[PDB]
């Protein structure tokens, strides 16, 4: 028990914090600010984070730590566990103080500037277009099954395709909700609650088809290269600069979307979308030295691994409706989702074949590793089919491709609305 | 080419330009989110340029304060001169007060500064080094009050605007939090207090390094393991220890007597207790330190942009550069010297050495000063002691201040 850690805190220490939480709770004394917010969010997220991480079935196939937190957290608002004050504190961090944006800003920046200048520019020509091909196939098949299921083209694109292809929960579902609310007007929690649910279904199908394409690859060897895609031939300060660039790149994106270039056409370009383009540009410009480029990564790690659990406590409070989540686990979606994955498989297989890669390998990295739950999923997918050596490719899909999906989404959303 | 090798806030001039261009686009277009992201974006960039400028200036850097002073003055001049936009003022203030980054900042500092100190060193230090510090404070107060009564300034003002701020651990750690405690207990604006306190404190800092060389002449005449996670736990403990302090001050123990105990004061006691309890492993204890470094070294400059905007009046700063104050300040330092000399003699230390570490290294500008003081007298090997004064002693000063303030009011 003492050797057991919660969020890297021994049980004795965690108790100290958990006691404090309860003192604030009983006495109903809590500042509705950053400090008060994080204090709660950290502790609550910590316990339920570990709980969702330890659970076997749940951990590998549902999402684990983050899912457990954003569900539990929402149940606290539903069940009336939280105090008005505590809800205020948490919401004040997420929306008023706008930690959500910072979080996403840091992620975008670190994910894009991490990728090496050459790898990025090179990847564009072959691997990037394959990804786009996968998306086309994912959309075309999705729309096809939706039209068969009497669901309009809007919904299929916004609540199924885009969210599935997006890079997971924190990186796809969460920011797509924000873009959705900024462009339609409808609540975020309506969207996230459905999107997170479908996305998770697809994540389970992605790891299943990964093993199916492995069997097909080993049965029909002319399609699979044995694990090879192609057919032929720092200190605090750096990390701090990452933070500067994270915010600065968001501000530029913001000034562009609000004043300079509000709309390429009728279509309104959301500031997050712009950011991806800006950061990507900043990478190619090479204004950032490799040390700084890593600094940005080191930040995104710190956020993704330490502050993610905090974020989820807030996501369950503001972005999560437990009812819509339940309502989206319809047996019909399970089919729609699965088929969209298949659309991505065939889309990336065709695309990669056209770009010079092996169809099987392309469908795994530029296809399934897109439809999977961002990073966590890449590991789980590439293990089902033994292709763990392409992890570097898979992350290009989950990172750059996930960034693509936001830009695409900002356009899809607007023009559709 | 050489310029391009020139870095601003660890950003090459080309890169900084990218940011500085963005700042100006936000400025011209008047498009800026009044939130964390928008705030830090500005504060980072502005603080960066003026931070370096104040750091490079020779006279200014060593004796006035340097990077942070330059920023909190320039920043205030921007509000005064109307350089900043209402939006930009809002963004920055929203980060400092609404979002309350100030408290987090102080919370992180307190936690990392106290939990860094080794359990034994802390408990041991209490018996001998700590009481010496208290003796120095007594002497600093008694001499201060003496000169103030001579100058027709009441005992309140001497204790609140001169003694406490001087003995406190500098700008970010003493002056800035003492303003917060002052405003929480009197009701009067923070900027009124900070603007005077920062000014006197800086004067004393210059006297401290001078007397350090004077006492030198009189003396000669007569685990390393770390992870992001540990640092993150530092953040948890920083906030958690503030929350406990807060719940205690607001509900459990609002007042020991008529006197109201401010939550920051409680925090110091709580964190110190948490250290002695040893609930925190050395890895975690370092984690808290590693955070406070990241804050103190990276986010300090941001903080100062906000301190010039909310906590700084340029007029009161000018008005406190009183030649009368120059005398009052100097004497308070002398009071600390003799106070720590007597105290240390009683505790078994050398009077000269005690007056330097438990005396001048108190009255100096926190950590920054300790280096400048221990260089004037060649005692650089006591830096570890000096930091106990600047850290633990600075924490003491807040607890004392919360009591002094309340009972006086
Ligand atoms: C027990 C293994 C199950 C495999 C199912 C497919 C059975 C064989 O499949 C057939 O094999 C031929 C090669 O000889 C191919 O030319 C055909 O395209 C293929 O469909
Ligand atoms: C409000 C957000 C504050 C984020 C600050 C995170 C700074 C963490 O910074 C990290 O600290 C670690 C611990 O020493 C080091 O090992 C890493 O190299 C360093 O970059
Ligand atoms: Na996906
Ligand atoms: Na001082």
Numbering used by the authors:
A (entry chain A): 18 to 250, 263 to 446
B (entry chain B): 16 to 237, 260 to 446
Extract from the study:
Our crystal structures reveal that the KpCitS protomer is formed by homologous N-terminal and C-terminal halves with inverted topology, each containing six transmembrane helices (TM 2–5, 7 and TM 8–11, 13) and one helical hairpin (TM 6a/b (or HP1) and TM 12a/b (or HP2)). KpCitS protomer can be divided into two domains; a central dimerization domain (TM 1–4 and 8–10) critical for formation of the dimeric structure, and a peripheral transport domain (TM 5–7 and 11–13) containing residues needed for interaction with citrate and sodium ions. Our results show that the KpCitS has a homodimeric structure in which its dimerization domain remains fixed during the transport cycle due to a hydrogen bond network as well as extensive hydrophobic interactions, while the substrate-loaded transport domain undergoes an elevator-type translocation (i.e. up and down) across the membrane.
Citrate-free KpCitS yielded a crystal diffracting to 3.6 Å resolution (form 3) with two inward-facing KpCitS dimers in an asymmetric unit. The dimers are practically identical, with Cα rms differences below 0.3 Å, suggesting that this state is structurally stable in the crystallization conditions. In the citrate-free inward-facing state, we observed that one water molecule takes the place of a citrate (right). Since the substrate binding site is continuous with the cytoplasm, water molecules are able to move deep into the membrane inner leaflet. In addition to the changes in amino acid conformation polar water molecules also seem to facilitate release of the substrate into the cell by breaking the electrostatic interactions between substrate and transporter. Conversely, D112, E195, R205 and Y348 form a salt bridge network in the inward-facing conformation, blocking entry of substrate from the periplasm. The conformational change to the inward-facing state relocates L408 and M417, opening the substrate binding site to the cytosol.
